[PDB]
UniProtKB/Swiss-Prot annotation, chain A:
Effect of mutating residue 6 to N: In strain: Omicron/BA.2, Omicron/BA.2.12.1, Omicron/BA.2.75, Omicron/BA.4, Omicron/BA.5, Omicron/BQ.1.1, Omicron/XBB.1.5, Omicron/EG.5.1; complete loss of interaction with host integrins
High-level lineage: Viruses, Riboviria, Orthornavirae, Pisuviricota, Pisoniviricetes
Assembly mode: Binds to host ACE2. RBD also interacts with the N-linked glycan on 'Asn-90' of ACE2. Cleavage of S generates a polybasic C-terminal sequence on S1 that binds to host Neuropilin-1 (NRP1) and Neuropilin-2 (NRP2) receptors. Interacts with host integrin alpha-5/beta-1 (ITGA5:ITGB1) and with ACE2 in complex with integrin alpha-5/beta-1 (ITGA5:ITGB1). May interact via cytoplasmic c-terminus with M protein. May interact (via N-terminus) with host bilirubin and biliverdin, thereby preventing antibody binding to the SARS-CoV-2 spike NTD via an allosteric mechanism.
Residues included from the entire protein: 400 to 448 of 1273
Effect of residue 46 to P: In strain: Omicron/XBB.1.5, Omicron/EG.5.1
Entry protein name: Spike protein S1
Stated consequence of mutating residue 45 to T: In strain: Omicron/BQ.1.1
């Protein structure tokens, strides 16, 4: 998916916020990996997306 | 500080001994006793029973 760069800290076990509890929640006993990279060159519009 | 328990920093101290017959320089706190000779006794010399 695509989220705001600052909200990237909300994708983690034991976290709280807005995206964490309303859009995507990870379990406390979660195993795996998370990969996020900047994509302002690909998903940006001068008018606004 | 808002990370999960699995990502909070932990301070680690590792103690490595080299227990050997060499004359020990570090010893635990014990008490000495007067020397007794020429009879069946139970002795303890620098941890050697």
């Amino acid at each position: 998916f695509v989220i705001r760069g600052d909200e990237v800290r909300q994708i983690a076990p034991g976290q709280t916020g807005n995206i964490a509890d309303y859009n995507y929640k990870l379990p406390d006993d979660f195993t795996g990996c998370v990969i996020a990279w900047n994509s302002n060159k690909l998903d940006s519009k001068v008018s606004g997306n | 500080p808002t990370y999960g328990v699995g990502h909070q920093p932990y301070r680690v101290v590792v103690l490595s001994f080299e227990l050997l017959h060499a004359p020990a320089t570090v010893c635990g706190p014990k008490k000495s006793t007067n020397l007794v000779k020429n009879k069946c006794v139970n002795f303890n010399f620098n941890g050697l029973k």
